[PDB]
């Protein structure tokens, strides 16, 4: 906990993350653009992120933003049963997502992420730590010092494990259960990106400036 305190990761979550029914896809994309601004503020509050070279900060956020945002709105959505809660104060119902052509990815979000976060009562410290692990992705291409990012990831998951063992000692598998939602998060992030590139290609869905910038090459 010493060089990567979970208390500071929780503080980062609480600092950035405080409904009416919502083309729902336009509303979803507007909320994503809004939350990219919030994501930069979140990352600056994660210990040692701001100490990396600027180029590496850019690389990590460009590599991770979609998984980072999906984890956040999925955890936010534990509070409803049949919908996703957008950061703009709008709810997207299952029926609304399906009627807009994005039912399959909606269903994956609810079945692989929201419902599983709810089932295990994943807390905000655990969410923040999983997000910090995603942020400190040492496989991100072009990093100036991948081993330094590897080291930061290791500090996060060591702190997370100690947190879980202290708060949930009756659940010895909890730490692994948390980490084992990251393959699903990766898949769902890739599928969301595929949709966004298609929306950009067809041109019938407004995409605001920061979301558009994240869809630039490379």
């Amino acid at each position: 906990n010493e060089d990567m305190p979970v208390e500071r990761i929780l503080e980062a979550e609480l600092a950035v993350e405080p409904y009416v029914e919502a083309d729902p896809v336009t509303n979803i994309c507007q909320a994503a653009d809004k939350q990219l601004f919030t994501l930069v503020e979140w990352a600056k509050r994660i210990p040692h992120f701001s100490e990396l070279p600027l180029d590496d900060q850019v690389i990590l956020l460009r590599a991770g933003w979609n998984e980072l945002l999906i984890a956040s709105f999925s955890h936010r959505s534990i509070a409803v049963k049949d919908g996703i809660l957008l950061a703009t104060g709008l709810h997207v119902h299952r029926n609304s997502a399906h009627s807009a052509g994005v039912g399959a990815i909606f269903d994956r979000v609810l079945t692989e992420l929201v419902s599983k976060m709810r089932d295990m009562q994943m807390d905000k410290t655990e969410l923040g730590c999983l997000r910090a692990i995603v942020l400190f992705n040492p496989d991100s291409k072009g990093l100036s010092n991948p081993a330094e990012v590897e080291a930061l990831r290791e500090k996060v998951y060591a702190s997370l494990e100690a947190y879980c063992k202290h708060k949930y000692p009756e659940q010895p598998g909890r730490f692994a259960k948390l980490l084992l939602r990251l393959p699903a998060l990766r898949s769902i992030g890739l599928k969301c990106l595929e949709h966004l590139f298609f929306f950009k290609l067809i041109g019938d869905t407004p995409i605001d400036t920061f979301l558009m910038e994240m869809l630039e090459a490379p």
């Binding site: 601004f37 600027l54 900060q57 956020l61 910038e213 630039e216």
Partner: peptide, 10 residues
Amino acid sequence: KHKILHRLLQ
């Protein structure tokens, strides 16, 4: 490149 992201990281 990445004009908005760089500005916000400043």
